[PDB]
Design an enzyme around this catalytic site. Sequence first.
Site, short mmCIF file in Angstrom:
data_model
loop_
_atom_site.label_atom_id
_atom_site.label_comp_id
_atom_site.label_asym_id
_atom_site.label_seq_id
_atom_site.Cartn_x
_atom_site.Cartn_y
_atom_site.Cartn_z
N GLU A 145 -6.17 -5.51 9.45
CA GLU A 145 -4.92 -4.78 9.57
C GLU A 145 -4.72 -3.90 8.32
OE1 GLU A 145 -1.89 -3.64 11.97
OE2 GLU A 145 -3.43 -5.14 12.46
N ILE A 204 6.51 0.52 4.88
CA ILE A 204 5.40 -0.09 5.59
C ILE A 204 5.18 -1.56 5.21
CG2 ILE A 204 4.33 2.17 5.47
CD1 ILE A 204 2.05 0.84 3.89
N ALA A 260 6.14 -0.65 11.20
CA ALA A 260 6.07 0.54 10.37
C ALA A 260 4.62 0.91 10.14
CB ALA A 260 6.76 0.30 9.03
N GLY A 315 1.91 4.73 10.91
CA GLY A 315 1.88 6.16 11.12
C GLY A 315 1.44 6.93 9.89
N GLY A 355 -2.53 -0.90 15.37
CA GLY A 355 -2.43 -2.27 14.90
C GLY A 355 -1.01 -2.79 15.05
N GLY A 392 0.85 -3.54 12.14
CA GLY A 392 1.56 -3.19 10.92
C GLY A 392 1.36 -4.19 9.79
N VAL A 393 1.20 -3.69 8.57
CA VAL A 393 0.95 -4.57 7.42
C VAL A 393 2.18 -5.33 6.96
CG1 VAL A 393 -0.98 -3.21 6.60
CG2 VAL A 393 1.33 -2.68 5.79
N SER A 394 3.36 -4.94 7.43
CA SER A 394 4.55 -5.73 7.12
C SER A 394 4.41 -7.13 7.72
CB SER A 394 5.81 -5.04 7.66
OG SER A 394 5.72 -4.80 9.05
C1 LIG Z 1 -0.93 -4.89 2.83
C2 LIG Z 1 -0.67 -3.79 2.54
C3 LIG Z 1 -0.35 -2.40 2.17
O1 LIG Z 1 -1.53 -1.74 1.62
C4 LIG Z 1 -2.20 -0.86 2.40
O2 LIG Z 1 -1.74 -0.51 3.49
N1 LIG Z 1 -3.39 -0.37 1.96
C5 LIG Z 1 -4.15 0.59 2.77
C6 LIG Z 1 -3.82 2.00 2.35
C7 LIG Z 1 -2.87 2.81 2.89
C8 LIG Z 1 -2.92 4.04 2.18
C9 LIG Z 1 -2.11 5.27 2.35
S1 LIG Z 1 -2.12 6.53 1.15
C10 LIG Z 1 -1.00 7.49 2.07
C11 LIG Z 1 -0.51 8.82 1.64
C12 LIG Z 1 0.15 9.71 2.54
C13 LIG Z 1 0.59 10.97 2.06
C14 LIG Z 1 0.38 11.30 0.71
N2 LIG Z 1 -0.24 10.44 -0.12
C15 LIG Z 1 -0.68 9.23 0.28
N3 LIG Z 1 -0.69 6.85 3.17
C16 LIG Z 1 -1.25 5.66 3.37
N4 LIG Z 1 -0.98 4.88 4.53
C17 LIG Z 1 0.41 5.08 5.04
C18 LIG Z 1 0.74 4.03 6.13
C19 LIG Z 1 -0.33 4.09 7.25
C20 LIG Z 1 -1.76 3.94 6.67
C21 LIG Z 1 -1.99 5.05 5.61
N5 LIG Z 1 -3.87 3.93 1.26
N6 LIG Z 1 -4.44 2.67 1.36
#
Ligand SMILES: C#CCOC(=O)NCc1cc(-c2sc(-c3cccnc3)nc2N2CCCCC2)[nH]n1
EC number: 5.6.2.2
Lengths: 203, 203
Positions: B28, B80, B86, B88, B103, B105-107
């Site tokens: 996830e 999130i 949460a 997207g 999925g 959601g990581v929450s």
């Molecule tokens: C458990 C747990 C939590 O850790 C995680 O969810 N770790 C995985 C992850 C998610 C992201 C980033 S960086 C980013 C972003 C967007 C715009 C500008 N800069 C960065 N967005 C995301 N996510 C947003 C939610 C959906 C998946 C992608 N980097 N690594």
Amino acid sequence: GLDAVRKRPGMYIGDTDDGTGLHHMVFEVVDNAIDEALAGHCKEIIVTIHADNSVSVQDDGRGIPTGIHPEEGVSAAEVIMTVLHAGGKFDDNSYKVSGGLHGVGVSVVNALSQKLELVIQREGKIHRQIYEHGVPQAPLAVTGETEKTGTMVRFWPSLETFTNVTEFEYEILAKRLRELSFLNSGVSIRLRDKRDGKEDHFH
Amino acid sequence: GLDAVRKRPGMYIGDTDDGTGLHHMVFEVVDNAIDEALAGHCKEIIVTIHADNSVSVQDDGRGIPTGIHPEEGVSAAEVIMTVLHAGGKFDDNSYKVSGGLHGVGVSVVNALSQKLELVIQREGKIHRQIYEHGVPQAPLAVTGETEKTGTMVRFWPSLETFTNVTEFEYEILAKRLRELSFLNSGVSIRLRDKRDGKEDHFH
Ligand SMILES: C#CCOC(=O)NCc1cc(-c2sc(-c3cccnc3)nc2N2CCCCC2)[nH]n1
Ligand SMILES: C#CCOC(=O)NCc1cc(-c2sc(-c3cccnc3)nc2N2CCCCC2)[nH]n1
């Protein structure tokens, strides 16, 4: 609810103008069919692009359960078609069993479809259910006998929702379908385009 | 809310007794990291099994956005981690942009974790946030300077939730990780087991 989905579709299905969301409608339904494959009941999934640019997804799994939960009074079919984030796993009596949701849920595909036709073959019967913009037009009906089991669904994406890119790209669908077939070795996955007659068979 | 998740975990993460749910906690989070890979910002994802049977997932993407929505007053990080379903896509200012949830959601991973530690490197800063059973212990804090960007998360699954199978199988994790690496050709995915020192590198 699904009203929230129809209001902000890009937030649930993805971008509704560049074709990302449109093609995600397909994979969301295909993901569900694969669950049946993984349970070892579905041997084939067939995805068809129709001339009016609707898509049907059919499988020869067990058929989505249609009988109401003996306590809750709602079937797995009804739940996963009309409840946001409904997914996971049910048993033959529509009890919910342990299992993760994954994807956004096909109730979203339903909500953003001008029309969705669900045809379920199981327990000796053909069951039918029409939705329009996510609203059931009648309760799920028994309309004939059959020896087959499986699920068929055709949906017509809403042109109130999807703009600019309103027609499906074969190559995009064939991309995902060819991948999944390699991950699930036993499951045959066919892709048919009725506009020009192209077929693919990923096994 | 997350109270509903903690109450009926198998319904969200999958079976909490045979190990299915436990390993789904990992994928996830990995699914989220791949989104960053697909956006062309993440070049490597590293999954580590720790001796106390927690798992960390780290990537060198942009880092989850930590600044509050200028209207809603909540960051993408907070959303999130604490809002069911949460997911997207967000932008650097934590505005939500079009994109599908996928999925569970990581929450959910957070809710079913005895402890989750989030460390985000971006805009020159290290940001930290501890959760326990899904409850933030303090607001997200800036604790130092850094030139790197990326996200690191380690979570300790709740032994109030997961039973019988409480330890991760390397082969299962290596299964999913090897698949994803082949689908996303540019993204290196490493797997490390700190219990015995086994490493894998899927590129
Ligand atoms: C458990 C747990 C939590 O850790 C995680 O969810 N770790 C995985 C992850 C998610 C992201 C980033 S960086 C980013 C972003 C967007 C715009 C500008 N800069 C960065 N967005 C995301 N996510 C947003 C939610 C959906 C998946 C992608 N980097 N690594
Ligand atoms: C659009 C749309 C809707 O069409 C579909 O979702 N079509 C895909 C599909 C789903 C299923 C079945 S059969 C079954 C089952 C379970 C127990 C006993 N017998 C059958 N369960 C499912 N799904 C339940 C919801 C999650 C995905 C799997 N067969 N084909």
